[PDB]
mmCIF file with all atom_site columns, C-alpha atoms in Angstrom:
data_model
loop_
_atom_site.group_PDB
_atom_site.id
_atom_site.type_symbol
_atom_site.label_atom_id
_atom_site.label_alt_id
_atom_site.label_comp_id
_atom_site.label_asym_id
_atom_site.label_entity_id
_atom_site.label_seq_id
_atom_site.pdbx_PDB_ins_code
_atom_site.Cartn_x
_atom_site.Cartn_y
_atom_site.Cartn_z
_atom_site.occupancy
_atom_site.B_iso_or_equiv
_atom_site.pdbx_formal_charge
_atom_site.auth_seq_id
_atom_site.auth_comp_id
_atom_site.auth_asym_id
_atom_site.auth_atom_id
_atom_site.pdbx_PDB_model_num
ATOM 1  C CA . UNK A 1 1  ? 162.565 135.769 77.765  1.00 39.16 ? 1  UNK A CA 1
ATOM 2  C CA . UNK A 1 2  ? 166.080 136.298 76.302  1.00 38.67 ? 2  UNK A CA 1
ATOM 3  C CA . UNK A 1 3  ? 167.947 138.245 79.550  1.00 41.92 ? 3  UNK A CA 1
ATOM 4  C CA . UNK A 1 4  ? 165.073 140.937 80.270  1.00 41.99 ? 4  UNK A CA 1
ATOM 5  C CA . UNK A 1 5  ? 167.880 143.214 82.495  1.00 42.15 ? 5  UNK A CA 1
ATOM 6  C CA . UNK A 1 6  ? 168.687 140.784 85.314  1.00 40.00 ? 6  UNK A CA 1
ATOM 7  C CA . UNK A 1 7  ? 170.878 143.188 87.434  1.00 38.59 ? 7  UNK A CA 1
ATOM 8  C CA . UNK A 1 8  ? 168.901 143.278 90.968  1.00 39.17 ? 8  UNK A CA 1
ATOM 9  C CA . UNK A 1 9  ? 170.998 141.193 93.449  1.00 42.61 ? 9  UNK A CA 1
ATOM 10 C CA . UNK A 1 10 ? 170.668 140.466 97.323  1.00 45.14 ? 10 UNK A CA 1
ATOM 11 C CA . UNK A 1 11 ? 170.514 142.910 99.728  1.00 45.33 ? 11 UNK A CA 1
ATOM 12 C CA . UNK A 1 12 ? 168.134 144.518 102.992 1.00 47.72 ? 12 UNK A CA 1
ATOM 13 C CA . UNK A 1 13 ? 166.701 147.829 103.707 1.00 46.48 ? 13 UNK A CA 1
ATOM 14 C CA . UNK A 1 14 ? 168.784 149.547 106.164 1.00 52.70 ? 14 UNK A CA 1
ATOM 15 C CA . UNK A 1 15 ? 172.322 148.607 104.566 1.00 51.68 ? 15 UNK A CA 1
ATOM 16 C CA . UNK A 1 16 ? 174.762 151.272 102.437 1.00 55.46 ? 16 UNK A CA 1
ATOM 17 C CA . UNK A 1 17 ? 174.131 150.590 98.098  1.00 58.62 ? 17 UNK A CA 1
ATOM 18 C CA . UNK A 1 18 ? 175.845 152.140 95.306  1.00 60.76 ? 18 UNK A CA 1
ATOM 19 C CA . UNK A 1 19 ? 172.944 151.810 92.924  1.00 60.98 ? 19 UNK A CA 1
ATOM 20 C CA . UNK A 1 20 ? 169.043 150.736 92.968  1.00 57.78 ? 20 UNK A CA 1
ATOM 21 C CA . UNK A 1 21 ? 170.572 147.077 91.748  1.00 55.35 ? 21 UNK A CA 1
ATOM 22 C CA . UNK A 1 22 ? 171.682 146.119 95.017  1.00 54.39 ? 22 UNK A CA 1
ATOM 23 C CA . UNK A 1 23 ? 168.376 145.021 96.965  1.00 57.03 ? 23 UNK A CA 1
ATOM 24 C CA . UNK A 1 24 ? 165.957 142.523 97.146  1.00 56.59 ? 24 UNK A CA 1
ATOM 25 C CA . UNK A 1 25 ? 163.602 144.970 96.934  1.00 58.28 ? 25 UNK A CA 1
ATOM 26 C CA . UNK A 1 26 ? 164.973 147.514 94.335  1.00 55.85 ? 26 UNK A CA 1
ATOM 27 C CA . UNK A 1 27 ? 165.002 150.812 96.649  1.00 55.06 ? 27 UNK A CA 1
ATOM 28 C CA . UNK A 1 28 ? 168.668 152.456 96.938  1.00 57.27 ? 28 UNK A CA 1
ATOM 29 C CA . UNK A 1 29 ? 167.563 155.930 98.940  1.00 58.38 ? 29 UNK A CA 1
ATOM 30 C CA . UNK A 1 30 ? 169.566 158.992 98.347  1.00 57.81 ? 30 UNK A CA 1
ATOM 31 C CA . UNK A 1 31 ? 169.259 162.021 100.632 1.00 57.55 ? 31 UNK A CA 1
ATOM 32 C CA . UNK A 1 32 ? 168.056 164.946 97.878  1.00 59.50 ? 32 UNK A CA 1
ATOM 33 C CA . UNK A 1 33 ? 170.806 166.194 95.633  1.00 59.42 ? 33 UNK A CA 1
ATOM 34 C CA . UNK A 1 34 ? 174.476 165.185 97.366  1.00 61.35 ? 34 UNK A CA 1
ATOM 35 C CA . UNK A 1 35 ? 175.050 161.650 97.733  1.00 61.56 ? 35 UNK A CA 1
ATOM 36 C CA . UNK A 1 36 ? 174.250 159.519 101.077 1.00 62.30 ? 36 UNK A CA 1
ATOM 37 C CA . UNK A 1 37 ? 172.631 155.964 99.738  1.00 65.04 ? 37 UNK A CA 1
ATOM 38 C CA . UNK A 1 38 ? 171.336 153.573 101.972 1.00 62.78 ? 38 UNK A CA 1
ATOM 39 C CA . UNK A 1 39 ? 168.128 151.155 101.014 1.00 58.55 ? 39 UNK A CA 1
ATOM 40 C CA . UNK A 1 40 ? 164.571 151.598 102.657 1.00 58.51 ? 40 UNK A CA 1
ATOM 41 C CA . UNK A 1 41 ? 161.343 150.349 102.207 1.00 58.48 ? 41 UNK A CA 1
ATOM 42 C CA . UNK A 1 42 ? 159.020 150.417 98.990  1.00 56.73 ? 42 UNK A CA 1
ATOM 43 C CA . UNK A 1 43 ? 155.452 153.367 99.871  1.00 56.74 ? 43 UNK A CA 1
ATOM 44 C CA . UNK A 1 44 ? 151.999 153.073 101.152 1.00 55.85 ? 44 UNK A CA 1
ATOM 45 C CA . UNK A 1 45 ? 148.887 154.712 101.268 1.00 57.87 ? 45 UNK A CA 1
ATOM 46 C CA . UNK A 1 46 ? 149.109 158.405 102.753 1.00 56.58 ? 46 UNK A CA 1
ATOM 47 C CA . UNK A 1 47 ? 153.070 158.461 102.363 1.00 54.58 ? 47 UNK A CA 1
ATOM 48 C CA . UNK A 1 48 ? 155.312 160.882 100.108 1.00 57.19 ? 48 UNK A CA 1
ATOM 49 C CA . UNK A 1 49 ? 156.999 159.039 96.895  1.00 57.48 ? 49 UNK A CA 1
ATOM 50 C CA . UNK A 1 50 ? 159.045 160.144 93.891  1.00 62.22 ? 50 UNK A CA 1
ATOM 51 C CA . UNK A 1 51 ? 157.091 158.453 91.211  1.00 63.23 ? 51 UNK A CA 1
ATOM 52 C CA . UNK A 1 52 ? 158.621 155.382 89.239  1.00 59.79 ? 52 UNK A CA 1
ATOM 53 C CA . UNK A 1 53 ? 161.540 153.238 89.357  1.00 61.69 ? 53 UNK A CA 1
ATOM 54 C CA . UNK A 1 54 ? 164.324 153.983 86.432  1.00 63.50 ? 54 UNK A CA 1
ATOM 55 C CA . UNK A 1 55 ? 167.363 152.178 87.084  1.00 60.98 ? 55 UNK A CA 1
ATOM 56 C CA . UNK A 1 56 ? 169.396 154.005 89.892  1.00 61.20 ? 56 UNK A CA 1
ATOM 57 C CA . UNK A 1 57 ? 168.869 156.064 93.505  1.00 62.11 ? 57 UNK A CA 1
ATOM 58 C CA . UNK A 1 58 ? 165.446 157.470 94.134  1.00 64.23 ? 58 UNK A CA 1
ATOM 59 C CA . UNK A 1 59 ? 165.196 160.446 96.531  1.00 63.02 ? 59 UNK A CA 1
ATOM 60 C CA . UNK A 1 60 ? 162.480 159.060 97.926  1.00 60.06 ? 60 UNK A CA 1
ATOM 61 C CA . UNK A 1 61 ? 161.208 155.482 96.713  1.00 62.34 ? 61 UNK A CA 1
ATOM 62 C CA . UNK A 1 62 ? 158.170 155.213 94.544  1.00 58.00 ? 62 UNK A CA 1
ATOM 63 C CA . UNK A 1 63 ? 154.783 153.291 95.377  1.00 56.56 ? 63 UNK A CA 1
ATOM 64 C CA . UNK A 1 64 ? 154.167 149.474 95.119  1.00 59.42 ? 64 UNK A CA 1
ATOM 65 C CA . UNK A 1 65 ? 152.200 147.227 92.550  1.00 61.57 ? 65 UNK A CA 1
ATOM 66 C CA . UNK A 1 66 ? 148.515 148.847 93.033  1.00 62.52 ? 66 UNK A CA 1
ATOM 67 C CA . UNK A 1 67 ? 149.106 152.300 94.034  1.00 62.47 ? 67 UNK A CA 1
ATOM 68 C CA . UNK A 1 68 ? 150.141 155.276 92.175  1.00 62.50 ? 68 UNK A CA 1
ATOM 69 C CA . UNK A 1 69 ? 152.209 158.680 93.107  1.00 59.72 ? 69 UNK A CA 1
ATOM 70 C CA . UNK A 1 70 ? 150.240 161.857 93.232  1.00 58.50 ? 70 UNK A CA 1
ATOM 71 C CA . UNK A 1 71 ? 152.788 164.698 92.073  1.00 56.33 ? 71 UNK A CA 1
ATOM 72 C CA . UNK A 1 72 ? 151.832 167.590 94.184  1.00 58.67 ? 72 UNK A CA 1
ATOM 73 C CA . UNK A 1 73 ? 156.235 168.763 94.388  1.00 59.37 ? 73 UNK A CA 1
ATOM 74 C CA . UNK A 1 74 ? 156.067 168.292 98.558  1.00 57.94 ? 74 UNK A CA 1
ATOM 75 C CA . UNK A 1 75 ? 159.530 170.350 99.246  1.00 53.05 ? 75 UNK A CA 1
ATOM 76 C CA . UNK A 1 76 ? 160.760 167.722 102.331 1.00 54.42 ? 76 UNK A CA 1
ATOM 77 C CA . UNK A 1 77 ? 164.289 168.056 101.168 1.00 53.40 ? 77 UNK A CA 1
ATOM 78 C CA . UNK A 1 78 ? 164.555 171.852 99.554  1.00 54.11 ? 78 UNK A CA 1
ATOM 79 C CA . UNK A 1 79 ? 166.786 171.512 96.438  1.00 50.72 ? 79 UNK A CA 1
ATOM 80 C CA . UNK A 1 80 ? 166.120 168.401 94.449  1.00 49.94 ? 80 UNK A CA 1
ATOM 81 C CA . UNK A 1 81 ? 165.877 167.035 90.486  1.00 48.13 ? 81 UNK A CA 1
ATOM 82 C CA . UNK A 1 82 ? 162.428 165.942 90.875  1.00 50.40 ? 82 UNK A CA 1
ATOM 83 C CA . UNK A 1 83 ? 158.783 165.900 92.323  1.00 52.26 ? 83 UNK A CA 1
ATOM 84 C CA . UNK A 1 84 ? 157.540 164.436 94.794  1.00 53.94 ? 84 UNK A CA 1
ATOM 85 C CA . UNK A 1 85 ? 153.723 162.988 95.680  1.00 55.70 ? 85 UNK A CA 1
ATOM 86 C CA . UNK A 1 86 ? 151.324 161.151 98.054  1.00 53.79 ? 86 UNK A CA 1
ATOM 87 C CA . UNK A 1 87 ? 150.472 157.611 97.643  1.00 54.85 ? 87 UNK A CA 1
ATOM 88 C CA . UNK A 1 88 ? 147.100 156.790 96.820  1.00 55.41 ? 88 UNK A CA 1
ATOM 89 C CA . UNK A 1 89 ? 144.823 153.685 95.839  1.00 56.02 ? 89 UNK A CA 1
ATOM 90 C CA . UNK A 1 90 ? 143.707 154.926 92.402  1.00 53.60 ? 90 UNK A CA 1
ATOM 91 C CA . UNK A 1 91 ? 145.762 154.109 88.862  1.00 52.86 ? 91 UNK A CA 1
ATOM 92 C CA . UNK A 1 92 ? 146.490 157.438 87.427  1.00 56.90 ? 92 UNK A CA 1
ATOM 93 C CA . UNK A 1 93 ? 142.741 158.025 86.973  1.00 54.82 ? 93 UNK A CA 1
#
């Protein structure tokens, strides 16, 4: 209730973002390690996701509201800070 973050503004996929707060939907995508930050779309079942959303550029953006990331590391990229997965229709267990 009292100002729970309120930072995401209004932007599409396919245009250049500093940060993850610049999107409709929150999804600034870096290219692995550099810099390079455009947004693109939110994953699906049988595609390769980070995991979660923090507050900044993701890699490779997570799944949406019903699937989870499954962290098997999936080196598309070669030198990274994190570990990527496949999108499946589970909930952690």
């Amino acid at each position: 209730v009292p100002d729970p973050r309120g930072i995401i503004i209004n932007l599409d996929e396919g245009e250049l973002c500093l940060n993850s707060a610049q999107c409709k939907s929150n999804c600034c995508q870096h290219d692995t390690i550099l810099s390079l930050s455009r947004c693109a779309l939110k994953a699906r079942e049988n595609s390769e996701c980070s995991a979660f959303t923090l507050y900044g550029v993701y890699y490779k953006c997570p799944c949406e509201r019903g699937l989870t990331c499954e962290g098997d590391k999936s080196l598309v990229g070669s030198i990274t800070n994190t570990n990527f997965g496949i999108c499946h229709n589970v909930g952690r267990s």
